[PDB]
């Protein structure tokens, strides 16, 4: 299990998600815990119902983004 | 914040990730907490260094998967 592996290295990943503000796309942002401050600086994502999230993942309308610390 | 929104609905999302066994692709699997049992039934993913994960996300070699409960 990946989370466990990272736990053993003292590493933790930060996850944030939501819909892009101007396109019908689910955005997943991921980075090391040390990059946390940068997440809030990024353009804001919108909350959305869990059903909408399922729809977007199933249609492949998802963008995963790496946030540099 | 999405996690918070879902917390208010008693909903929780399960996240698992790792590299696909036969292709250079980072796989992210997501589903409702009630779908947890199904995750372990799925083909196994491989642990990988956090640096490799960053590389894969940055090159766009990522597949997000929805796990039905």
TrEMBL record, chains A, B:
Q: What's one Pfam family the UniProt record gives for this protein? A: DUF3248
Lineage top rank: taxon: Bacteria
Name of the protein this chain belongs to: DUF3248 domain-containing protein
